A paper describes a structure:
This structure reveals a 5-nt pre-ordered seed sequence in the crRNA adjacent to the PAM duplex. The 5′ end seed sequence was also observed in other Cas12 nucleases, including Cas12a, Cas12b and Cas12i. The most significant conformational changes happen in the C-terminal half of [name].1 (RuvC, REC2 and Nuc) and N-terminal half of [name].2 (REC1 and WED); both move outward upon the formation of the crRNA-target DNA heteroduplex between them. The lid motif of [name].1 transits from the closed to open conformation, exposing the active site to accommodate ssDNA substrate. However, almost no conformational changes are observed in the RuvC domain of [name].2, further suggesting that [name].2 is not responsible for substrate cleavage. Although both copies of the [name] effector protein are necessary for the complex's functionality, this evidence suggests that [name] still adopts a conserved mechanism for activation of the RuvC nuclease site like other type V nucleases.
[name], also known as Cas14, is an exceptionally small type V-F [name]–Cas nuclease that is roughly half the size of comparable nucleases of this type. [name] associates with a crRNA and a tracrRNA, which can be fused into a single guide RNA ([name]), to target substrate DNA. An asymmetric [name] dimer is bound to one [name] for recognition and cleavage of dsDNA substrate with a T-rich PAM sequence. Despite its small size, [name] contains all the conventional domains of Cas12 proteins, compared with other known Cas12 nuclease structures.
Author numbering:
A (entry chain B): 7 to 525
B (entry chain A): 4 to 525
Write the structure that this text describes.
Amino acid sequence: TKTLKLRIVRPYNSAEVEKIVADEKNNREKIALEKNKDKVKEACSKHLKVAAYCTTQVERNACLFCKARKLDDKFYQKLRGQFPDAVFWQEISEIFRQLQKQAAEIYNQSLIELYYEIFIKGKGIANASSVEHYLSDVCYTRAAELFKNAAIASGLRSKIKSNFRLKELKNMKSGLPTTKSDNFPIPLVKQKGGQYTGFEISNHNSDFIIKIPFGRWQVKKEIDKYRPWEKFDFEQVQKSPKPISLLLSTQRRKRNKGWSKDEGTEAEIKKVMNGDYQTSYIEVKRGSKICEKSAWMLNLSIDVPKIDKGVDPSIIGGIDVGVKSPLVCAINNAFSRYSISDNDLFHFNKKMFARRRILLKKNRHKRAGHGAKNKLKPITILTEKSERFRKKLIERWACEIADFFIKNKVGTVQMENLESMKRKEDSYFNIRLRGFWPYAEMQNKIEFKLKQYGIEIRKVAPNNTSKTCSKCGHLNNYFNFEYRKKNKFPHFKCEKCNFKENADYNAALNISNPKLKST
Amino acid sequence: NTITKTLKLRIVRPYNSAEVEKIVADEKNNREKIALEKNKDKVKEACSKHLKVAAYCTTQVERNACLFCKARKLDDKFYQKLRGQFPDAVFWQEISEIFRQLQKQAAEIYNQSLIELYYEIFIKGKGIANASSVEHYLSDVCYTRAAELFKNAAIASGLRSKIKSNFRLKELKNMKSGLPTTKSDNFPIPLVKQKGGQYTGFEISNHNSDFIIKIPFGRWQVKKEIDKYRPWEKFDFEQVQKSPKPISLLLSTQRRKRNKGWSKDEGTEAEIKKVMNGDYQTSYIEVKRGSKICEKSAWMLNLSIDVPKIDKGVDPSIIGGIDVGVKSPLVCAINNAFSRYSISDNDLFHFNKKMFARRRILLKKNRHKRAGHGAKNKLKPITILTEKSERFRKKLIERWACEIADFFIKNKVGTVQMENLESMKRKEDSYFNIRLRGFWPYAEMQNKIEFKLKQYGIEIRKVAPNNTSKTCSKCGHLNNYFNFEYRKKNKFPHFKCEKCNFKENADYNAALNISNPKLKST
RNA sequence: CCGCUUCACCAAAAGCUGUCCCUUAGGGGAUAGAACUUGAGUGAAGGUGGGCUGCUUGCAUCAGCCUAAUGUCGAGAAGUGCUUUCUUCGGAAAGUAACCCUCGAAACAAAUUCAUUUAGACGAAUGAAGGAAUGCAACAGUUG
Ligand SMILES: [Zn+2]
Ligand SMILES: [Zn+2]
Ligand SMILES: [Zn+2]
Ligand SMILES: [Zn+2]
């Protein structure tokens, strides 16, 4: 099962109507061009670099040109009068808010009525069959006769059946969590197996076209003063449907910043469109980020069974020591990296050193009579307990690396060899931690943890890492470690590739290189 | 006309009687005399409170290296003797399990009454319910249920007043918010008794320079069924009028007497002093638990009080304004007398940055840090440091608010003008929102500054907030060039007018706009 | 050690200027200048550099105490997941114990009990009942 977040700029009614939209958008754009001959000098971005005569590019957010490209609902209303089946952005966003508040009201009121029905009249003793009877006989009919698409009512039946828990609240340990109606989409479920193909998603220019079936939604004569939204009907699909199709824009915003694309999900959407990857859920709500809380995205939810893979020796991992981290892990194929935390061990050594230097100043003439026997008594118990802490921390690190590789499904990791490891000046060790460390138990515990998950070890031990780039083995021999402390450990810039890289990840990439062999 | 407040104080012990308390006070005096003549000057640590009355020694100590005060401490076998001697007397363990049962039952009845009233308003009533219907259904359901379980009327009227002050009807009418429901066991019992004119409330008695409150209560009895599923439901709570047993508590004040402000008229010690002196009749009594300290939680107590407003020289002809700054957190601006206030002395954030580094290194990889023992323990260090940092933040905010109020009383402004909240979250010239991503809650800050200016009768006017960082203040010349990235790339300079050459602090302009009275409110 | 503080000295990847291109939505790359700044750089000094209790809280100091504590564990089985059995729509029951599964566990000091090798000290406890600093600054709170 998965949840996949895509965006929408506009509906897609037909071909020629959105053609007319683009054409008259460009027509107002060229009217803004030919009118602004030093009437404004903001030089909207794009508009200046394409064909214009303006002075200064301003940041493309408060300039006059895109407001002209921002179309008007007078023109949209005249378009609606030529073509009544050409619906637009405000119409679909009103329908979004209307269905969202509809489902939120029906959901919350049916929850509280179920809770009351079970626990105060019937005294808390019934079955879940009565819950399903309330579902089918009350809220299925309510959502199917408030809007005549019964599949949405079945999806709400599924949603409330998941969201209402009888046996939890039987002990009254908590309460029913209610929303502020900004956290609530609409189900729009179809069948999983075969017959209901699912939302008829097609391809477009690096983007998609959805098809969501509906009815007629006659705009009512009485637009209610108390109720600012409910004026539609959403008539029967079995009598007279009219499926709304929308343009699914693939722009994923990165935390209120510009337009970006993430491509770990586009292949999954293509797998939906070929015929496999049988999704059944289109959640329609706002985004959870800044300024996407007003623009309506879409959420495709999918289900796949647990198809296990295991590990394979084609994937070849690497484990290297770090300078900010005590260790790092790297895979030669994908990005797929992993740091190891430092701060807990750092604060622990800080407290241990502070305790030691406290005890080494309030003892020097204070505990008399014994000599340095009972002066040395409390530091030893500290050191056994510190050693047990270091052992448990190393076991936690080994289990973390094992979980990392098992999620990444790596068959074998090439781990850098031990005597070569300890004789390294670039490590996090031998800089602050001088030499006081049990390296061999760490290696043996890592190997035992990995072989518990069944992953072999290689001992490849190259001649010179930490300055050879993974893209091209230039052997950038100006990376002296003295130079690195002289530049306070800067990035690794492979100058022949113009390859600026986090300075230790490439060192971990050299250990994952399978072309060099073991020892 | 009046401003509400609460006072949080700690319960020391259940004050029992006059005779039994005379017995225990004389027993403390007896132990003091016994260890007075037991020590034939094997001691030189007579504490300061003892050198005046019994001094055969050398020096003074810090009132914890004493022995006579240590002799005043009472054991627990003598309390078992007092348990056997007086079965009518009350003691901590019984009162604590009473209050735990009361917290559990009050939370359950509060949840059941909230969903009951939501049902009888919106489901069966089809949403057809004005506010008078809601009060009618409050009195119809919640008071009847609470008097059906608790034979007290005080707890019943308290639950009705608490649910009335919690069921915010208009937001759940137009679907604007979420239905409340509690989760925590730290749920305070409301305890309302009225106070208007021919009634007083709870009988505050200053017996011997201390504080004794008197909660009316019935004669509880021991249960018979003790089910294994729910342990704490183990009492009966019989009727006040058939069998009154007033639980009377003692609240600590010895720490408050040693403050700088105790012989004054404005610090909260003077409100406690007037509560001792008859007036400031309380009405609303919360019984919380404090920090979990040493296997036995110290139950706090909250005392409502309707203080009259301090006059303190108010004349709303004078007008001042405040902002959010970039060098100071808050800057205050006087319209005409050219007076400015700022606060630019604290080292608070390396502290909150070490905790946030610790939270992030716990949070982002929680998978093996402390697993196998629930999620209440898995976030246990985080909860202690978040509560302590929010307490530090609230106390710094209240110190800021008192400095602001002292400034405005020093410059005699009768009414202050403050920004709209919907703009304050979206105001990126702030000293906040650039150092801090999602940390600070500003609604509580504004509530504290609103209350602290209300404490001198200075009113707070919501204003038109639009583009205040660039509109000038000496003359309204509308210098709309002073953009955000323009401000960053000029190294955060002075704002200067295009034609006044008004080179002054930009945030000080951003409040001297609001300090000019010509802005209409909203 | 210190990604602790102060002082002094020192280096510039990160920030600015300026240049140039590419879409210029997000911004991406390099070359010369300065130190506001930075530094997990150097030297002198001191300093829990984590907490707990001290009677509502915070900072600083002080008295005593805990710390492997960002740790490690105790008990369970309300819930999540998983196995088996049934109606086979949909859930139940038995477990299992992996779980952002549930409840918990360190911290002033008098005094008391029981026990320990020989009145000293340790252990297990006991557990509220004004036994507790100084100085500044405040001190409506819950719920949503
Ligand atoms: Zn523009
Ligand atoms: Zn390379
Ligand atoms: Zn004394
Ligand atoms: Zn101006």
